[PDB]
Structures are given as structure tokens and as C-alpha cells.
Write a protein that binds this DNA or RNA. Structure first.
Lengths: 257, 257
DNA sequence: GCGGTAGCCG
DNA sequence: CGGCTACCGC
């Protein structure tokens, strides 16, 4: 079996007490991480090596930042989109254990009336052309990450109220779904269709977990031949309940490979 | 037995992971704290209550701040000196288990040539008069705190280097010793008159403990009849080695009463 | 809320 | 080094 996970860590240097024990327990083949919030020269790579994980990383000071930890040595590592602004701190790609892995931290967008929202839409359009150009859909590939898009009403707690939210607004949803149409399968919905499963609970929301006030903007998207072999996918609530948790949960997929 | 401790905590809300386990393990009758750095309405009372400790506290935002935790309910609680500026955030006094407890965070002084050092000197003069007026030296009383004064050469690592340091300058030493000559016994020196023992190691001095690069500016001072019963007094080095420690060490005195 | 940033400070 | 005052981002 092959296990691939994705996890927005909200600062890797402030989350090793979660990530390292979680890797020891769950032993995924590949863990994609977002919002590492660290410059490359300060990335805590030794902490991963000591538990038998390779780790590749791309980030700048204070914000954004992406990394992939793996049991097998990553090859053919690249950073960013292939056009300006490259945003190396938002996209890291590698061939790992025969899998083409693309890990994205999509711009969140701030508010729909902002320049940042237009930048998010443009990023999703650029990502479309990037993946159309570079992904072999007859091969095993996974596009993982924190997409900052909840594509269907089941992916948000209150679809009726969130029409103007940057993570649920129609333009972002349409742009994200345009990429899925290339032939990515949202494996969470292969296994758990139409089921309230959230990968994010806002720190600011009192009792968020207990009252089900979450979002599902994180995804593992697999090419058709890999998706066909997906036998499980779930969000792990345990690290979200631990002391000093990330606001996101890991999302885990298991393939019959 | 009766156990009394003093501990400069460098922000109580940042030090509960040290202080609460420390109380549970050491079970002192009285713990005086300095540099709590918290306004009264935000003092973490419940943390002490849930381990069976009373706590009384006096402080404003971000600087200074004093508190006393005790097994027995404090009585006749007062804040500050009895003259303007009162500095309620630098003195808290209470009758606890029949003992008159005075907890001070003496002005540090900054530099020898500054208005702040003058303020430190007049504060010590004011404290002399306050204690002379209000302490019965026939009764059980303890004056403890972070005095920001190392009275003798044994109390500092480099007496020569530090002649003009605010915590070891002759003016502050004589002002402090003037208070002691009222009848206060520095119990650390009753038990360990000749030992190099420190209650502070600067965070910035790498290897300070091994290198003996410490200061002893914290004290537990007892009236003669209480002092006569002192059987032990030591600084606890263990919490100084802990993750995210205070820069100061708990100073502990035990009395056979 | 709770990550990050900078400069101030002992 | 690790508190503070502030701010910034999600």
C-alpha cells in the first residue's frame, strides 16, 4: 500500500511537536506540508532525518512556504509556477517513489473585492495551464495542498451564508473545478461522498469542532489510474485536538499500490 | 515544617508550565513571585486554585507585577509602599499562616549615571522607613523578593568587573544593607555562608551555569525568631534547565515551625 | 486565535 | 535569549 498525506502546519518550527510524532505513528510514504513559514536556511530538516524522512522545502521568511517529507529520496525537484511571479514559496514538485507529486499553497484571496482575490484567480488560471502542460494523466500523479477552495456546498458548514467568502465564491470555485476537469479525482469524495468532513477549523471560532463549524479546502487530487487504486481517504482529527494544534487537520489517502 | 519560596517568573502567563508543576512537586506553604507582568484582571488565578492554592496579586500591563500563592488564605492584603509613588506593582504584603509576608520587586536601576538608579536608591530608603515602621522584629515576618542587589562579593561571579553595575554598585549595596541591619536575617547565608549559589543566570550568556556566570540578587529575609528556626535554604537549579525557563531560580527556605 | 515580523530591554 | 509593545495575515 501507498499512503500520501497533506497538512497545513501553520509554521513548521512551531508544529514539530505534532508533525514528528504524527509521522512516527502514521508512517506515510509522502507528506506534503503548507504554511511552513520559514526560510530554507532555517528549515528544521534534521528533525525529519532523525525519524527516517527525507524532506525537501521551498519558503521565505515568515509566510507561505511548502515542503514534502518522504521515505524515498525525492528526485527532479522544482519550485514555483513556470511563469512570473513564480511563487516558489507556494509550489514544490518532485518525483517521489515513482509518483509525480505537486504540492500547492494557493493564495487565500483576503476579500473578493481585493487585488489579492484577482491574484488568486489568476494563480488558479496559471496553475491550470501549468498542470495541463506538465502532468501525464496516464501516469501516477498527485496534486496535493491547501487549495483555499471549498468546491462543493458539502465542503463548508454554511453554504447559504458564504457566497462572498474568498474560499467559497463562485469565481474561485469555477477556476479550481476547471483544473479538476483535466482529469484529477478528489479522492476524499471517492471514499466519502456527500459527507461533512472538515480539514480546517478557525482558531477564532469558539467551540468550532464541537459545533461543526469547519471548512474542507485541503485536497488530494489523483490522476485516473492512481485514483482507481484509492482504497481509503480521511481527515485525522487527533492532531487538531492535541495541545498547540495547527488550525488544519492532516488529510490522508491510501492507494492499492 | 514551613516552606517559603521566592521566584522571579519573567511573566506568569508565560511561566505556568514551570510554576504549576513546581508547586505540585514542592508544595511550599508560601510562594512569592516577581515580574508577573500581567494586569490584575488577566492574572491566571484559576491555574493556582485548581491545585488548591490561594493567590493574591498586584500588577499592571507588561512590566513589574508581584503575587503570593499560599496554602492558607491570605489576610490583611496590602499593595505598594505607604508613600507616593506607591508602586503597587512592586510590593504585595499579606498575613499568611500567622506570618507577616512582604514581597518586593525592587527597581533594577538601569545604569549608575541614570535617573532610574536614583529612583532605586530612594525606593530602598523608602522601604527602610516602611519596614522600620511596620515590622515587629519580635514577630514572625519574612521579606522576600527580587532585590536587584547582590550584597556581598560572594553574590556575584565577577566582583571586579561589576563594580559599576546597578546590582552590585556600592550605593545600592549600602542602601540594601541598611534595611538588613533593622534585624532581617538573609537565611541563605545562615545555612550557606560561604557557598557560591546563584538565583539568576542571564538568558544571553551561553553556558552560564557551567561557567559559574550567575548572580544572587533574590533573597528570603526573616526576623530573628523566624530565622532561628530555619533549617534549610537552597536555590533550585532544575527549573533553570527546563524548556522556556525563567532566567531566575526559585529560592527556598524551610523553617522548623 | 495564533502563527509570523520588527525594535526595545536586561 | 526571551519577555515586552506593536503590527500583519489568514
Amino acid at each position: 500500500m501507498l499512503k500520501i498525506a497533506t497538512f497545513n502546519v501553520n509554521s513548521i518550527r512551531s508544529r514539530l511537536h505534532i508533525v514528528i510524532p504524527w509521522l512516527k505513528e502514521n508512517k506515510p510514504d509522502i507528506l506534503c506540508m503548507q504554511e511552513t513559514k520559514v526560510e530554507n536556511r532555517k528549515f528544521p530538516e534534521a528533525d525529519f532525518h532523525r525519524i527516517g524522512y527525507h524532506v525537501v522545502f521551498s519558503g521565505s521568511k515568515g509566510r507561505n512556504g511548502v515542503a514534502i517529507a518522504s521515505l524515498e529520496e525525492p528526485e527532479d525537484v522544482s519550485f514555483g509556477l513556470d511563469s512570473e511571479p513564480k511563487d516558489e514559496d507556494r509550489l514544490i514538485r518532485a518525483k517521489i517513489a515513482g509518483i509525480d507529486v505537486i504540492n500547492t499553497y494557493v493564495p487565500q484571496g483576503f476579500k473578493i473585492d481585493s487585488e489579492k482575490y484577482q491574484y488568486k484567480l489568476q494563480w488558479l488560471e496559471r496553475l491550470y495551464h501549468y498542470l495541463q502542460k506538465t502532468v501525464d494523466f496516464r501516469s501516477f500523479a498527485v496534486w496535493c495542498g491547501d487549495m483555499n477552495v471549498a468546491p462543493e456546498p458539502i465542503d463548508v458548514h454554511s453554504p447559504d451564508k458564504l457566497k462572498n467568502h474568498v474560499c467559497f465564491h463562485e469565481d474561485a470555485r469555477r477556476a479550481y473545478k476547471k483544473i479538476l476537469e483535466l482529469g484529477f479525482v478528489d479522492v476524499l469524495r471517492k471514499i466519502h461522498p456527500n459527507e461533512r468532513i472538515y480539514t480546517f477549523y478557525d482558531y477564532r471560532v469558539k467551540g468550532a469542532i464541537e459545533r461543526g463549524l469547519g471548512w474542507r479546502g485541503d485536497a488530494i487530487l489523483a490522476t485516473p489510474p492512481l485514483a482507481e487504486r484509492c482504497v481509503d481517504c480521511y481527515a485525522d482529527i487527533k492532531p487538531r485536538l492535541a495541545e498547540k494544534p495547527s488550525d488544519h487537520l492532516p488529510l490522508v489517502a491510501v492507494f492499492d499500490v
